[PDB]
Amino acid sequence: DDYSLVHKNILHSEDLLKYILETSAYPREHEQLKGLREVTEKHEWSTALVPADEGLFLSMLLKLMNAKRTIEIGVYTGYSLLTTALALPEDGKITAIDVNKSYYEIGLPFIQKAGVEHKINFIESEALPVLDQMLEEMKEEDLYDYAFVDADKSNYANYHERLVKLVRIGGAILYDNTLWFGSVAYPEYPGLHPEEEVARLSFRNLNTFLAADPRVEISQVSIGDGVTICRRLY
Amino acid sequence: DDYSLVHKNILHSEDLLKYILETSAYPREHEQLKGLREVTEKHEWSTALVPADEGLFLSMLLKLMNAKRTIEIGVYTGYSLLTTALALPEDGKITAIDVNKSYYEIGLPFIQKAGVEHKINFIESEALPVLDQMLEEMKEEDLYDYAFVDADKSNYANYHERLVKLVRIGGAILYDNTLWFGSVAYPEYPGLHPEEEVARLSFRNLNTFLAADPRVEISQVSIGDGVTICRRLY
Ligand SMILES: Nc1ncnc2c1ncn2[C@@H]1O[C@H](CSCC[C@H](N)C(=O)O)[C@@H](O)[C@H]1O
Ligand SMILES: Nc1ncnc2c1ncn2[C@@H]1O[C@H](CSCC[C@H](N)C(=O)O)[C@@H](O)[C@H]1O
Numbered sequence: 125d126d127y128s129l130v131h132k133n134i135l136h137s138e139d140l141l142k143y144i145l146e147t148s149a150y151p152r153e154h155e156q157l158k159g160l161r162e163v164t165e166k167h168e169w170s171t172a173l174v175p176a177d178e179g180l181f182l183s184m185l186l187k188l189m190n191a192k193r194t195i196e197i198g199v200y201t202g203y204s205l206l207t208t209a210l211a212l213p214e215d216g217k218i219t220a221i222d223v224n225k226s227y228y229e230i231g232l233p234f235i236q237k238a239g240v241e242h243k244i245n246f247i248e249s250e251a252l253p254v255l256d257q258m259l260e261e262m263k264e265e266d267l268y269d270y271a272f273v274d275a276d277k278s279n280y281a282n283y284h285e286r287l288v289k290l291v292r293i294g295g296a297i298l299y300d301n302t303l304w305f306g307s308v309a310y311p312e313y314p315g316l317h318p319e320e321e322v323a324r325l326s327f328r329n330l331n332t333f334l335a336a337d338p339r340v341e342i343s344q345v346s347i348g349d350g351v352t353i354c355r356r357l358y
Numbered sequence: 359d360d361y362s363l364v365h366k367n368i369l370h371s372e373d374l375l376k377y378i379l380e381t382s383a384y385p386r387e388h389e390q391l392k393g394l395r396e397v398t399e400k401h402e403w404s405t406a407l408v409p410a411d412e413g414l415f416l417s418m419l420l421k422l423m424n425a426k427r428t429i430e431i432g433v434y435t436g437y438s439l440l441t442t443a444l445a446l447p448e449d450g451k452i453t454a455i456d457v458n459k460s461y462y463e464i465g466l467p468f469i470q471k472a473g474v475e476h477k478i479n480f481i482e483s484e485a486l487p488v489l490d491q492m493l494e495e496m497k498e499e500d501l502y503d504y505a506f507v508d509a510d511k512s513n514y515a516n517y518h519e520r521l522v523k524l525v526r527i528g529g530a531i532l533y534d535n536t537l538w539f540g541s542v543a544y545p546e547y548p549g550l551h552p553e554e555e556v557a558r559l560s561f562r563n564l565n566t567f568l569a570a571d572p573r574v575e576i577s578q579v580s581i582g583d584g585v586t587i588c589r590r591l592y
């Protein structure tokens with residue numbers, strides 16, 4: 125009623141997305157992930173929730189690459205965070221960052237019931253100052269295997285400049301929402317809320333930049349709202 | 359053309375697909391992959407060609423899991439095979455299986471000029487006999503890291519029972535076309551060629567079976583025509 129893109133999906137039909145969720149995603153969704161999702165769906169910002177089919181995709185990536193130490197930028201109620209914590213080994217460690225811990229406390233009971241809260245170091249701050257402080261203290265043997273970026277959309281390019289130094293060589297950086305409900309496909313797009321237009325132009329610039337960035341290999345994956353996987357080359 | 363689905367997209371517009379390919383895939387596509395794709399686009403069976411954005415996704419998965427030995431079932435002109443060979447290290451090895459070597463001869467010059475043909479063992483045969491002989495010969499030290507299944511659609515479930523024993527624990531099995539142009543989303547779908555309808559039902563059964571299969575964790579990804587990633591648990 126205030127933002128324009130919230131009822132749009134990138135697949136050709138709602139029926140196909142429902143088929144995917146019902147056939148493949150929900151039967152593989154942890155019970156605490158199911159709980160966190162269903163309370164979040166009643167929250168006013170439920171449009172920002174990472175969907176269940178994308179969540180299982182993040183879980184698969186974490187396990188295939190044997191991730192141990194991860195960083196999560198943009199937590200909200202914690203669906204992707206809890207997804208990550210359940211995918212990591214028992215000794216896995218996550219640095220979670222979000223300006224608003226009130227959202228996080230919506231999901232924390234489910235994280236606790238899942239028995240994975242011990243893996244999480246939550247920092248209530250803006251992401252950039254923490255990443256900049258991490259650049260001064262980071263030791264080469266302390267680099268992250270994996271980074272999920274899902275915070276302020278207009279700041280992804282700034283996040284990238286830090287994360288290509290905070291993630292190990294061969295580690296992964298994942299940028300959520302890089303297709304922005306399909307609106308990135310046109311130079312001009314009508315009738316968006318000013319912040320949705322800022323994010324749209326930001327993603328158009330980020331997609332072009334990442335495609336030309338020699339520090340990484342990339343794969344833009346038309347899952348959820350678009351996820352761009354980056355792999356650090358040096 | 360006899361098939362009915364060949365031109366249907368699973369994204370909501372051609373413009374979105376073309377944005378992804380033009381922005382994120384084509385600029386990252388190896389020169390020999392581009393040449394192979396262009397020749398194949400002129401072939402009568404170009405519909406079955408793995409698309410460029412999915413190719414980068416397959417390549418990203420291989421590198422993040424540091425795959426070294428792979429199997430490829432369903433080669434055609436070799437786009438995904440070349441993709442796999444370019445991702446592997448210099449001493450990587452691939453077993454490629456297809457019933458029609460003449461398709462493979464179309465892309466072979468591009469594979470050779472990429473300098474990666476030495477990694478490929480091409481077997482001109484039906485996949486099931488080869489897979490069965492592989493299970494009779496395979497030692498635990500020889501198990502594959504990664505398997506890409508993209509051959510006779512109605513036989514995926516049969517391939518699956520062999521491949522869950524031929525990929526290592528923690529190894530990945532990927533099935534192509536698991537969304538089948540979106541037509542899997544409904545119990546019935548009018549206007550299909552008979553063997554288009556057989557594949558559709560075979561994928562509907564396959565997707566339900568894979569979601570319940572305790573031997574693997576899965577992730578169905580709405581990229582290309584749908585890719586289902588399986589990871590062997592035991
Ligand atoms: N500058 C900033 N630094 C850190 N977090 C920020 C931020 N600006 C916005 N955010 C947070 O980023 C989140 C985006 S919604 C994130 C969704 C979440 N990944 C999921 O799994 O569902 C919001 O919770 C918002 O509070
Ligand atoms: N029983 C069988 N065993 C092995 N290959 C088969 C087969 N039946 C069909 N095929 C082959 O499977 C291929 C499917 S098209 C595969 C496309 C390819 N993966 C790409 O990257 O473009 C065809 O080449 C067909 O010849």
Ligand SMILES: Oc1ccc(CCNCc2ccc(O)c(O)c2)cc1
Nearest residue numbers: 127171172173274301319320323349
């Ligand atoms: O300042 C904004 C930016 C965008 C909107 C519209 C969509 N709401 C944000 C959103 C949507 C999906 C996500 O995945 C995500 O992280 C966030 C509203 C206010």
Ligand SMILES: [Mg+2]
Nearest residue numbers: 172274300301
């Ligand atoms: Mg998001």
Ligand SMILES: [Mg+2]
Nearest residue numbers: 406508534535
């Ligand atoms: Mg295919």
